[PDB]
Amino acid sequence: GSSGSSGSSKELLMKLRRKTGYSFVNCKKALETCGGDLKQAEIWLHKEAQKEGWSKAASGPSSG
């Protein structure tokens, strides 16, 4: 349990990588936009996809 330059989210990035499945660079964005929140991070990526259209499959358009 040690670290160097305090100010980075890797442990969460690696986890969110397998959770959602999106590339590392991607998850990183959702993690920064949300603030290290697997939940608020998993929903983001999915949402962005629905709008942008990264993958064919339907992400899941929700209201409010």
- Contact in structure between 49 and 59 (CB atoms under 8 Å): yes
Instruction: Report how far residue 2's alpha carbon sits from residue 10's, in angstroms, rounded to the nearest whole number.
Output: 13
- Contact in structure between 44 and 33 (CB atoms under 8 Å): yes
Helix (H, G, I), strand (E, B) or coil at 1: coil
Instruction: Tell me the technique behind this structure.
Output: NMR
- Contact in structure between 26 and 15 (CB atoms under 8 Å): no
When divided into structural domains, the chain yields a total of 1
Range of the domain at 22: 1-64
